[PDB]
Amino acid sequence: SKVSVAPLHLESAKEPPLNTYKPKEPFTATIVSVESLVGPKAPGETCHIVIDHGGNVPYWEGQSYGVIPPGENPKKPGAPQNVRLYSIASTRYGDNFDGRTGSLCVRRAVYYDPETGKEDPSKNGVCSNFLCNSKPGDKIQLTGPSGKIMLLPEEDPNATHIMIATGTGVAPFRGYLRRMFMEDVPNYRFGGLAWLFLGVANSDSLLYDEEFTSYLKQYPDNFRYDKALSREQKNRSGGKMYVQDKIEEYSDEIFKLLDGGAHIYFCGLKGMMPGIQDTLKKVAERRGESWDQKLAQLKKNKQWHVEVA
Ligand SMILES: Cc1cc2c(cc1C)N(C[C@H](O)[C@H](O)[C@H](O)COP(=O)(O)OP(=O)(O)OC[C@H]1O[C@@H](n3cnc4c(N)ncnc43)[C@H](O)[C@@H]1O)c1[nH]c(=O)[nH]c(=O)c1N2
Ligand SMILES: NC(=O)c1ccc[n+]([C@@H]2O[C@H](COP(=O)([O-])OP(=O)(O)OC[C@H]3O[C@@H](n4cnc5c(N)ncnc54)[C@H](OP(=O)(O)O)[C@@H]3O)[C@@H](O)[C@H]2O)c1
Ligand SMILES: [Mg+2]
Numbered sequence: 314s315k316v317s318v319a320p321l322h323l324e325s326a327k328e329p330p331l332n333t334y335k336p337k338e339p340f341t342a343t344i345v346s347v348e349s350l351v352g353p354k355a356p357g358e359t360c361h362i363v364i365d366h367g368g369n370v371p372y373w374e375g376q377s378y379g380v381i382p383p384g385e386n387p388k389k390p391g392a393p394q395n396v397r398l399y400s401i402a403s404t405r406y407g408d409n410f411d412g413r414t415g416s417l418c419v420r421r422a423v424y425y426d427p428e429t430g431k432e433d434p435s436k437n438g439v440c441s442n443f444l445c446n447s448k449p450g451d452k453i454q455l456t457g458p459s460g461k462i463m464l465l466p467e468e469d470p471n472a473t474h475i476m477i478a479t480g481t482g483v484a485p486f487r488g489y490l491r492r493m494f495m496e497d498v499p500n501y502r503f504g505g506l507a508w509l510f511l512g513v514a515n516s517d518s519l520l521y522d523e524e525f526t527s528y529l530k531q532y533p534d535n536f537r538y539d540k541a542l543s544r545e546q547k548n549r550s551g552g553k554m555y556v557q558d559k560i561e562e563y564s565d566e567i568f569k570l571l572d573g574g575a576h577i578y579f580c581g582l583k584g585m586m587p588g589i590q591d592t593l594k595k596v597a598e599r600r601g602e603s604w605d606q607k608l609a610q611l612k613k614n615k616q617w618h619v620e621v622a
Contacts, residue, residue: 315497318406324500329373330458336396339381339454342366344447345414352517356544358421359481359520360445361402365414370455374488375463376401378415379456382440396456397440400463400484400580400620404491418484418520419444463620465489466576471505473575475567477556477589479512482581482621483520494528494536505535506570512541512556512585539563556585557592564596571607576616583621 334340345363364378372378379396386392399417407414422438425431447453463485466472474493476486486509493503513519519540528536539559546554549561560567571577579586590604597604611617 318410318496323405334456339456340370342453342455344451347447350520354517356514360419362417363414372458374465375485376458377460381454382443402484402487404488418481420481421445473506473570475577476509477579479581479585494532508537510539510556514544557589561592578618580620
């Protein structure tokens, strides 16, 4: 059955926390664990980081933490580094079900010369490698939380939520789905449909696949799960199989759900959105509908939720 969580007073706030800690006086949190999420054939390393905030930096699902990596702003001598934002991949109770930790899902940004393939560590991403290089007991400068675009609408506990992720864009949806299915939250009993679409390079690049597959067996009437493995599968048109191609496979069901009030969420690569728009336009055209008019209505009805970078 569902996992007991504490403390219940995390359900009492009527508004999400915002900017509890600011860049000039961050919260000094402590690393609990860092682990790789991926196998040896993944094109890059993605890690799962558990951070002890001690209850001092609570958040709601869908929000982000800021991390200030150590060192000096290169474009501003004497200044600290700029904040980098990370979508929180845990529920408000965290991976230890106690309200004391939050988790991040972090892709290592690594530079390769585009002609020779030669790596250059000096051009690697600062914060992402700082995080995935961290060890238990290391300190992390935390800011935030921030963000409201990806808060989960809970007014209707039987709503439908269609979740479209590329890579580490899966992060908020891990939190959504643990709250919907894993945790014993008496004041949110989800009875709708949650449908996760996840695009990653290959099987070794899957993120939290065991957890999501377990929801298929535990909640077969409330959860659906489809994967697009871009370097292991090809789409109808001959391109790499992307999430937009998986959406097209279920176009009629998805459009019916949207017409019925479903929420739809997009998180991950900003580059996926032009392809998704192109696919949805083509689907609409085949149905004899205008995607522009449909998208305008979805935005007006607050059904359309995008956070990409
Ligand atoms: C709201 C929101 C939420 C999230 C994210 C963004 C936003 C806006 N991101 C992205 C994250 O904030 C951050 O941008 C990345 O982790 C990269 O930051 P670094 O500090 O590692 O790279 P840094 O900012 O240092 O560098 C940026 C890029 O430039 C490259 N670069 C540096 N010097 C170069 C040079 N001389 N020539 C060419 N290239 C060079 C780096 O290799 C890197 O790819 C994210 N990410 C994630 O993995 N998980 C998440 O959950 C989220 N969540
Ligand atoms: N809240 C947020 O805004 C938020 C949260 C988390 C992450 N992000 C951003 O999302 C990024 C996710 O990157 P990642 O490194 O984890 O993923 P990645 O491995 O670069 O890509 C994930 C999958 O998306 C595919 N893809 C590439 N181009 C695409 C396109 N135009 N349309 C559809 N799919 C496409 C990739 O295929 P190929 O590589 O085979 O082309 C891969 O299969 C992060 O780097 C971060 O910048 C943003
Ligand atoms: Mg794996």
